[PDB]
């Protein structure tokens, strides 16, 4: 929820400058930080999808190991 | 496409703050303030959508992780049974 | 102002040219945003991430945040490689380390990553059909639930059920009599609470050692409101003298193991006297 507080600080700095070049630099810096956070969120989403694919890959391997283990039980 | 619209609204807000910095008239300042406020509202809506999508993906990973843990627990039970039967036949 | 950040990213793209063309708070902020952009571009594309982190450590709260971002962007194995890199590059280094470790411990699975959970906790410590007897099953794992909560052994009814169940289980342990050179001819971490097995565990000696040690740890804890009946204390002493005899009856080296248990429990009393 820190992006909402960053947006509130950006809106406060915009209202303060609207009523001064250092505040312009601060607005550009907060804009770039919000861009970096929005770029981060999609990478987190893609990482979650890759972990889902990895879990669904491991599940069938555990199925195959159980299928071998039953045969080992019968032979023993 | 959501990230492209995000960066496009950021370019809009950069153009508006460059307009204010070059202008530094009340009607132009009010128009720039209204368009910038529309930009801030779009950015907040996009942030809400991003956090909702991230929480959905996190829960969707967590359920599959729980199921993999349970199925691995059954595999551990069966491997303990195999190991005990093998130790018993090497005893016998 | 974007000319400055493009100048810094051209300075990065290796360490000497970056340190030369990097040449004050806003300059360091643009440097940090440049490292954020470069690490984002390299996450979009492992080892190069470690190269950039070494460069940031050569320059220098920015590497904490950047390691947090890279650990939040990579799935499983690359986080393990980065955690090996963190264990190698300590350099005595706060709150962001705790946040990274807490998010890792929340993200893991504890079935295939128990070793990695142990490594994270070491890092945090370094910083700071077949016929089945169902009755024995139910009584045994109810005793296990009593072991997991030692506070419950102070009421009347719960203590009476503990007396009955523990005496029945120790009767089974006395009456089975394993008497085992079989061991002369993957690690199971938790107990396997399965109805179907229940007899391959009673034929083992390690399982009996775990249960008798768990009894001894509970009895050493109860010796340290919260009053005890003298009859309960006599029962504790009788069962303690029986459990030491049962540990002496384990076939691999019961007497040496019992002496080890005695000395370790005495030192546990000495340790509990401090705290």
UniProtKB/Swiss-Prot annotation, chain A:
**Where does the UniProt annotation locate this protein?**
Cytoplasm; Nucleus; Nucleus speckle
Purpose of the protein? Component of the THO subcomplex of the TREX complex which is thought to couple mRNA transcription, processing and nuclear export, and which specifically associates with spliced mRNA and not with unspliced pre-mRNA. Required for efficient export of polyadenylated RNA. Plays a key structural role in the oligomerization of the THO-DDX39B complex. (Microbial infection) The TREX complex is essential for the export of Kaposi's sarcoma-associated herpesvirus (KSHV) intronless mRNAs and infectious virus production.
- Family listed: Belongs to the THOC7 family.
Q: How does it assemble?
A: Tetramer; as part of a THO-DDX39B complex. Component of the THO subcomplex, which is composed of THOC1, THOC2, THOC3, THOC5, THOC6 and THOC7. Component of the transcription/export (TREX) complex at least composed of ALYREF/THOC4, DDX39B, SARNP/CIP29, CHTOP and the THO subcomplex; in the complex interacts with THOC1, THOC2 and THOC5; forms a coiled-coil dimer with THOC5; together with THOC5 and THOC6, plays a key structural role in the oligomerization of the THO-DDX39B complex. TREX seems to have a dynamic structure involving ATP-dependent remodeling. Interacts with NIF3L1.
Q: Which gene encodes it?
A: THOC7
Residue numbers of N6-acetyllysine PTMs? 16
| Annotated segments matching region Interaction with THOC5 | 24-76
Annotated protein name in UniProt: THO complex subunit 7
From Swiss-Prot, chain B:
What is this protein's tissue specificity according to the annotation?
Ubiquitously expressed.
Superkingdom classification of source: Eukaryota
Q: Where in the cell is it found?
A: Nucleus; Cytoplasm
Interaction with CSF1R: region residues? 1-89
Q: What PTM annotation applies here?
A: Phosphorylated on tyrosine upon binding to activated CSF1R; which causes a dissociation of the two proteins.
Record family assignment = Belongs to the THOC5 family.
| Biological role | Component of the THO subcomplex of the TREX complex which is thought to couple mRNA transcription, processing and nuclear export, and which specifically associates with spliced mRNA and not with unspliced pre-mRNA. Plays a key structural role in the oligomerization of the THO-DDX39B complex. Regulates the expression of myeloid transcription factors CEBPA, CEBPB and GAB2 by enhancing the levels of phosphatidylinositol 3,4,5-trisphosphate. May be involved in the differentiation of granulocytes and adipocytes. Essential for hematopoietic primitive cell survival and plays an integral role in monocytic development.
Relate the assembly described in the record.
Answer: Component of the THO subcomplex, which is composed of THOC1, THOC2, THOC3, THOC5, THOC6 and THOC7. The THO subcomplex interacts with DDX39B to form the THO-DDX39B complex which multimerizes into a 28-subunit tetrameric assembly. Component of the transcription/export (TREX) complex at least composed of ALYREF/THOC4, DDX39B, SARNP/CIP29, CHTOP and the THO subcomplex; in the complex interacts with THOC1, THOC2, THOC5, THOC6 and THOC7; forms a coiled-coil dimer with THOC7; together with THOC6 and THOC7, plays a key structural role in oligomerization of the THO-DDX39B complex.
Protein name, as recorded = THO complex subunit 5
Q: Which gene encodes it?
A: THOC5
UniProtKB/Swiss-Prot annotation, chain C:
Q: Which portions of the sequence form the region Dock domain?
A: 94-128, 129-275
| N6-acetyllysine PTM positions | 94, 190
User: Which domain of life does this protein belong to?
Assistant: Eukaryota
PTM comment, free text: Expression is altered specifically during apoptosis and is accompanied by the appearance of novel forms with smaller apparent molecular mass. Polyubiquitinated, leading to proteasomal degradation; probably involves NEDD4.
Pinpoint the Glycyl lysine isopeptide (Lys-Gly) (interchain with G-Cter in SUMO2) cross-link: 16
Q: How does it assemble?
A: Component of the THO subcomplex, which is composed of THOC1, THOC2, THOC3, THOC5, THOC6 and THOC7. The THO subcomplex interacts with DDX39B to form the THO-DDX39B complex which multimerizes into a 28-subunit tetrameric assembly. Component of the transcription/export (TREX) complex at least composed of ALYREF/THOC4, DDX39B, SARNP/CIP29, CHTOP and the THO subcomplex; in the complex interacts with THOC2, THOC5 and THOC7. TREX seems to have a dynamic structure involving ATP-dependent remodeling. Binds to the hypophosphorylated form of RB1. Interacts with RNA polymerase II. Interacts with LUZP4.
Disease annotation reads:
Deafness, autosomal dominant, 86: A form of non-syndromic, sensorineural hearing loss. Sensorineural hearing loss results from damage to the neural receptors of the inner ear, the nerve pathways to the brain, or the area of the brain that receives sound information. DFNA86 is characterized by progressive, bilateral hearing loss that is most predominant in the high frequencies, begins mildly during the fourth decade and gradually progresses to severe-to-profound deafness in the seventh and eighth decades.
Q: What is known of its domains?
A: An intact death domain is needed for apoptosis.
Please state what the protein is called. THO complex subunit 1
Q: What species does this protein belong to?
A: Homo sapiens
